[PDB]
Design a protein around this motif. Structure first.
Motif, PDB file in Angstrom:
ATOM      1  N   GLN A   1       2.578  -0.492   9.595  1.00  9.12           N
ATOM      2  CA  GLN A   1       1.435  -0.224  10.366  1.00  9.12           C
ATOM      3  C   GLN A   1       1.562   1.082  11.355  1.00  9.12           C
ATOM      4  N   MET A   2       2.596   0.858  12.050  1.00 10.10           N
ATOM      5  CA  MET A   2       3.193   1.815  13.249  1.00 10.10           C
ATOM      6  C   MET A   2       3.634   3.089  12.756  1.00 10.10           C
ATOM      7  N   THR A   3       4.670   2.909  11.803  1.00 11.16           N
ATOM      8  CA  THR A   3       5.071   4.170  11.437  1.00 11.16           C
ATOM      9  C   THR A   3       4.024   4.897  10.481  1.00 11.16           C
ATOM     10  N   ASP A   4       3.012   4.380   9.411  1.00 12.06           N
ATOM     11  CA  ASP A   4       1.963   4.844   9.242  1.00 12.06           C
ATOM     12  C   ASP A   4       0.771   5.580  10.016  1.00 12.06           C
ATOM     13  N   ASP A   5       0.573   5.104  11.153  1.00  9.00           N
ATOM     14  CA  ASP A   5      -0.012   5.681  12.471  1.00  9.00           C
ATOM     15  C   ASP A   5       0.555   6.882  12.915  1.00  9.00           C
ATOM     16  N   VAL A   6       1.906   6.911  13.036  1.00  6.86           N
ATOM     17  CA  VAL A   6       2.715   7.968  13.226  1.00  6.86           C
ATOM     18  C   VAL A   6       2.389   9.015  12.244  1.00  6.86           C
TER      19      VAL A   6
ATOM     20  N   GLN B   1      -2.806   2.223  -0.481  1.00  6.28           N
ATOM     21  CA  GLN B   1      -4.032   2.337  -1.138  1.00  6.28           C
ATOM     22  C   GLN B   1      -4.339   1.010  -1.687  1.00  6.28           C
ATOM     23  N   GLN B   2      -3.430   0.100  -2.163  1.00  9.04           N
ATOM     24  CA  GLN B   2      -3.678  -1.270  -2.686  1.00  9.04           C
ATOM     25  C   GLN B   2      -3.765  -2.319  -1.292  1.00  9.04           C
ATOM     26  N   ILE B   3      -3.100  -1.996  -0.475  1.00  9.37           N
ATOM     27  CA  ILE B   3      -3.366  -2.621   0.878  1.00  9.37           C
ATOM     28  C   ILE B   3      -4.763  -2.352   1.518  1.00  9.37           C
ATOM     29  N   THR B   4      -5.105  -1.078   1.695  1.00  5.72           N
ATOM     30  CA  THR B   4      -6.294  -0.743   2.337  1.00  5.72           C
ATOM     31  C   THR B   4      -7.524  -1.330   1.460  1.00  5.72           C
ATOM     32  N   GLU B   5      -7.368  -1.243   0.091  1.00  4.20           N
ATOM     33  CA  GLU B   5      -8.319  -1.972  -0.807  1.00  4.20           C
ATOM     34  C   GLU B   5      -8.512  -3.567  -0.353  1.00  4.20           C
TER      35      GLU B   5
ATOM     36  N   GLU C   1      -7.343  -5.149   2.232  1.00  6.95           N
ATOM     37  CA  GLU C   1      -7.864  -5.420   3.642  1.00  6.95           C
ATOM     38  C   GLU C   1      -9.418  -5.040   3.754  1.00  6.95           C
ATOM     39  N   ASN C   2      -9.784  -4.114   3.049  1.00  4.89           N
ATOM     40  CA  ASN C   2     -11.251  -3.949   3.210  1.00  4.89           C
ATOM     41  C   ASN C   2     -12.159  -5.370   2.676  1.00  4.89           C
ATOM     42  N   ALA C   3     -11.605  -5.795   1.458  1.00  3.41           N
ATOM     43  CA  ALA C   3     -12.035  -7.022   0.914  1.00  3.41           C
ATOM     44  C   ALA C   3     -12.532  -8.158   1.741  1.00  3.41           C
ATOM     45  N   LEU C   4     -11.373  -8.221   2.739  1.00  3.53           N
ATOM     46  CA  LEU C   4     -11.007  -9.371   3.553  1.00  3.53           C
ATOM     47  C   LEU C   4     -12.541  -9.435   4.869  1.00  3.53           C
ATOM     48  N   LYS C   5     -13.094  -8.362   5.046  1.00  9.43           N
ATOM     49  CA  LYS C   5     -14.078  -8.023   6.192  1.00  9.43           C
ATOM     50  C   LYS C   5     -15.047  -9.084   6.170  1.00  9.43           C
ATOM     51  N   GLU C   6     -15.680  -9.142   5.028  1.00  9.18           N
ATOM     52  CA  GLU C   6     -16.965 -10.371   5.002  1.00  9.18           C
ATOM     53  C   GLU C   6     -16.399 -11.587   5.011  1.00  9.18           C
ATOM     54  N   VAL C   7     -15.210 -12.238   4.568  1.00  9.94           N
ATOM     55  CA  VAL C   7     -14.738 -13.599   4.883  1.00  9.94           C
ATOM     56  C   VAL C   7     -14.641 -13.691   6.353  1.00  9.94           C
TER      57      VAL C   7
ATOM     58  N   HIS D   1       3.330  -5.415   1.835  1.00  4.75           N
ATOM     59  CA  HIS D   1       3.826  -4.616   2.585  1.00  4.75           C
ATOM     60  C   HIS D   1       5.531  -4.999   2.553  1.00  4.75           C
ATOM     61  N   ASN D   2       6.006  -6.294   2.089  1.00  3.51           N
ATOM     62  CA  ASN D   2       7.367  -6.274   1.878  1.00  3.51           C
ATOM     63  C   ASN D   2       7.954  -5.226   0.936  1.00  3.51           C
ATOM     64  N   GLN D   3       7.243  -4.910  -0.156  1.00  7.52           N
ATOM     65  CA  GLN D   3       7.796  -3.673  -1.062  1.00  7.52           C
ATOM     66  C   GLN D   3       7.864  -2.588  -0.287  1.00  7.52           C
ATOM     67  N   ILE D   4       6.740  -1.906   0.598  1.00  6.25           N
ATOM     68  CA  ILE D   4       6.980  -0.886   1.189  1.00  6.25           C
ATOM     69  C   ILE D   4       8.343  -0.962   2.374  1.00  6.25           C
ATOM     70  N   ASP D   5       8.341  -2.276   2.741  1.00  5.85           N
ATOM     71  CA  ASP D   5       9.412  -2.413   3.739  1.00  5.85           C
ATOM     72  C   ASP D   5      11.018  -2.102   2.836  1.00  5.85           C
ATOM     73  N   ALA D   6      10.968  -2.666   1.525  1.00  2.00           N
ATOM     74  CA  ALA D   6      12.147  -2.445   0.977  1.00  2.00           C
ATOM     75  C   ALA D   6      12.461  -1.079   0.736  1.00  2.00           C
ATOM     76  N   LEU D   7      11.352  -0.268   0.371  1.00  3.30           N
ATOM     77  CA  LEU D   7      11.692   1.157   0.143  1.00  3.30           C
ATOM     78  C   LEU D   7      11.921   1.977   1.213  1.00  3.30           C
ATOM     79  N   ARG D   8      11.124   1.671   2.342  1.00  6.58           N
ATOM     80  CA  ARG D   8      11.452   2.152   3.578  1.00  6.58           C
ATOM     81  C   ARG D   8      12.667   2.292   4.283  1.00  6.58           C
ATOM     82  N   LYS D   9      13.389   0.752   3.997  1.00  4.51           N
ATOM     83  CA  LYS D   9      14.591   0.585   4.415  1.00  4.51           C
ATOM     84  C   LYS D   9      15.750   1.753   3.518  1.00  4.51           C
TER      85      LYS D   9
END
Ligand code: HG
Ligand code: HG
Ligand code: HG
Length: 739
Positions: free
Chosen positions: A444-449, A483-487, A489-495, A547-555
């Motif tokens: 989240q922080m590294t995307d913000d940057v 993209q997958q994550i933000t899709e 994360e948007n789905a969650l809003k109403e719940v 996220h853990n996939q992104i983490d794996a690749l980022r590393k």
């Protein structure tokens, strides 16, 4: 907050203030002549405690040094106020007889302490070895006084008719009812001529309208300071505690101020932790609701802060030309008020919280619900993320307005205590509890940057070395998984919205109690909430999964580009510094380079600690937490930081952040080098400039602790002595607040 601009308010706090006589203080602080007490320049009935550093012939501080006599006096006096408060509000008669007997015992205990503790042995030196003869003499006096204090406090319980626990409760009660501003002034190493640095804690308490009614009070009051006296004492209590606005900067000879740091100390655990003991699933869900209720208070207080970070011109600039009044009133206060109302009414407000938590979530011994402290808070911050909270903004002294505010959460949780990262198969702590969330948070922080990069760097290509860093820092393309994550994360809003409102309703019912319950609706309400949470948990798991996939690749990406990233950082500095120091370069240009570099430097150093998994080594103990807090403060988020009560771990984090912010701001450059973090403290008779600054930082902590507990402190158990200038001796004094 006072609806004055924060810079102007700080300016006044550093003024000539009116002294307050002892008998009119809200609290005993001791150390007379060092801890000077004054009236607040702006708020009626508010007080300010200010300490100026003084030094001995060797340049070693004489202020901020534990003295057991003073601490004994603090403890006696602060317990006497709790005692008299209990006896005043109680049913039993002979109130004066009991109060005077308490006084009488306090006189006798003070006198006996003074006839028994020699002054030449009563004081500690923080910046020396705990094993020096002089410090061994202080320890010995301390054990003596501890002995007298258990006697005094036993006698108080007997005389007053109240138990130890109730006296302690009432103590926390009356102290947080009228909290003082606390200030420490000192000249940092290499301060300029006639200039000085400062750090202040200014208390923040506002009660949302939802809290006002639930705490028995009524919604209509504009002034909504923290108040438990009008409350009906169901076990749960509403409102955040041990939270203060933290400001550090410099004061110029003309008395103007440049602010170098602006964040929050705390809040503490965002739930009523003690309530946990012996709790059924009903009481637990109710605790989760108190945390939600408390989260909207945080949201309210972050929006209030945004406002006070704005000058009148800023608010003016942000009101479309056609809503501006032809005339702004003569009263400077009634003008800001109108300015705030117009601003809020015409601008969507959004706020971002970066909560760096420093508890150890997975701890399995002496746990103190550090698991729920991670979990309930991460839950509730996320329950609010990417939605809007109905909130109140104070605009004037009897005026306010209601707005929605957009909220955005970033939460991280890396331990700092002995259990922070236990060895393989060690059953004393489970290191895995925060794995997912910390991954999520680093992404989240590294995307913000990155997003900040695409935005600014796009338009400042006078600086080639800045382009090349950008390319490198973009990391691996991870757009698809994002993209997958933000899709999802948007789905969650109403719940989340359904979840929040249902939980709020749950607490209205539960808060009634036995003779008042309507079991069928309680059970119904619990059930809807659970279903929502089951479903939210489910989607949270697939989000972490991604996220853990992104983490794996980022590393993988990191482990292989580390060298180039540093070279490229070095090269930005080398081209960037001499512009910053050119006296013909304009201020706004300087800001921009500095922010761009410091932001990237924070991110990259965090990456090293996180990706190489070294954040938890002793020598690196608060660095990753400090680097992310610092980064979030560059990205202009509000940084909240905490431990359970925030007297101990959270204060040491605040020290590392404020001290870094001060060190960095006073560079030739204003550019982060990490010396304030990396430098190995030596505790010698001759120390470096960084260590000399470090020596200064425990003083606001002893004041803050005194205001919370009655006595000085901070009892954080140092993990690596080279991380801190002091030797922890305020910790032994802090033990007085237990007994
Ligand atoms: Hg607050
Ligand atoms: Hg950057
Ligand atoms: Hg900052």
């Amino acid at each position: 907050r006072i609806t004055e601009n924060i810079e102007t308010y700080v300016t006044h706090l550093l003024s000539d203030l009116e002294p307050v006589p002892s008998q009119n203080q809200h609290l005993a602080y001791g150390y007379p002549g060092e801890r000077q007490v004054f009236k607040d320049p702006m708020l009626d009935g508010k007080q300010v405690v200010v300490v100026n550093s003084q030094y001995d012939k060797h340049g070693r501080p004489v202020t901020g040094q534990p003295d057991v006599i003073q601490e004994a006096n603090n403890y006696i006096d602060n317990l006497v106020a709790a005692a008299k408060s209990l006896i005043d509000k109680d049913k039993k008669g002979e109130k004066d007889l009991r109060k005077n007997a308490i006084d009488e015992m306090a006189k006798t205990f003070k006198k006996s302490i003074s006839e028994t503790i020699p002054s030449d042995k009563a004081k500690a030196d923080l910046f020396s070895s705990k094993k020096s003869s002089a410090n061994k003499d202080f320890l010995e006096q301390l054990a003596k006084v501890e002995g007298s204090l258990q006697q005094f406090t036993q006698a108080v319980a007997k005389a007053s008719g109240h138990k130890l626990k109730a006296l302690d409760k009432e103590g926390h009660n009356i102290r947080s009812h009228n909290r003082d501003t606390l200030i420490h002034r000192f000249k940092a190493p290499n301060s300029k001529e006639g200039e000085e640095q400062f750090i202040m804690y200014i208390p923040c308490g506002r009660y949302t309208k939802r809290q006002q009614r639930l705490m028995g009070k009524d919604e209509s009051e504009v002034n909504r300071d923290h108040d438990t006296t009008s409350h009906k004492r169901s076990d749960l209590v509403l409102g955040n505690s041990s939270m203060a606005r933290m400001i550090a900067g410099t004061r110029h000879s003309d008395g103007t101020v440049t602010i170098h740091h602006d964040s929050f100390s705390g809040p503490g655990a965002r739930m009523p932790y003690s309530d946990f003991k012996g709790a059924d699933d009903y009481k637990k869900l109710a605790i989760k609701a108190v945390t939600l209720i408390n989260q909207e208070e945080v949201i309210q207080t972050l929006a209030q802060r945004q406002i006070d970070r704005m000058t009148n011109e800023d608010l003016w600039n942000k009101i479309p030309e056609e809503y501006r009044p032809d005339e702004l009133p003569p009263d400077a206060e009634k003008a800001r008020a109108q300015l705030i109302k117009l601003y809020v009414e015409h601008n969507p407000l959004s706020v971002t919280e970066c909560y760096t938590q420093v508890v150890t979530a997975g701890q399995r011994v002496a746990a103190e619900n550090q698991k729920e402290q991670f979990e309930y808070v991460r839950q509730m911050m996320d329950a609010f993320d990417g939605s809007k909270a109905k909130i109140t903004i104070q605009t004037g002294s009897n005026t306010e307005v209601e707005t929605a505010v957009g909220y955005q959460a970033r939460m991280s949780s890396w331990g700092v205590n002995w259990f922070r990262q236990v060895g393989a198969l060690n059953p004393l702590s489970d290191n895995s509890v925060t794995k997912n969330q910390n991954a999520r948070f680093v992404n989240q922080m590294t995307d913000d940057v990155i997003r900040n990069l695409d935005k600014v760097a796009q338009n400042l290509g006078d600086y080639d070395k800045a382009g090349a860093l950008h390319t490198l820092l973009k990391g691996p393309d991870v757009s698809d998984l994002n993209q997958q994550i933000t899709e999802k994360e948007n789905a969650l809003k109403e719940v989340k919205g359904a979840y929040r409102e249902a939980l709020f309703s749950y607490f209205e019912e539960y808060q009634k109690g036995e003779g008042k319950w309507d079991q069928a609706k309680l059970d119904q309400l619990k059930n809807q909430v659970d279903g929502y949470e089951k479903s939210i948990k489910k989607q949270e798991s697939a989000i972490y999964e991604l996220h853990n996939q992104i983490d794996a690749l980022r590393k993988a990406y990191y482990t292989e580009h580390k060298g180039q990233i540093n070279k490229a950082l070095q090269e930005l500095k080398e081209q960037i510094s001499p512009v910053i120091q050119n006296k013909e370069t304009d201020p706004e240009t300087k800001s921009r380079l500095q922010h761009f570099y410091n932001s990237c430097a924070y991110l990259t150093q965090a990456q090293e600690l996180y990706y190489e998994n070294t954040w938890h080594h002793g020598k690196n103990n608060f660095k990753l937490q400090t680097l992310m807090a610092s980064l979030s403060c560059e990205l202009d988020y509000a940084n909240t930081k905490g431990s359970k009560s925030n007297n101990d771990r959270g204060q040491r984090l605040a020290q590392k952040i404020v001290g870094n912010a001060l060190w960095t701001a006073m560079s030739e450059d204003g550019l982060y080098t990490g010396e304030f973090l990396d430098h190995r403290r030596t505790h010698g008779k001759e120390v470096s400039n960084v260590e000399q600054l470090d020596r200064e930082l425990t003083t606001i902590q002893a004041l803050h602790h005194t205001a919370n507990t009655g006595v000085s402190g901070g009892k954080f158990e140092i993990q690596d002595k080279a991380n801190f200038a002091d030797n922890g001796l305020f910790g032994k004094v802090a033990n007085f607040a237990k007994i």
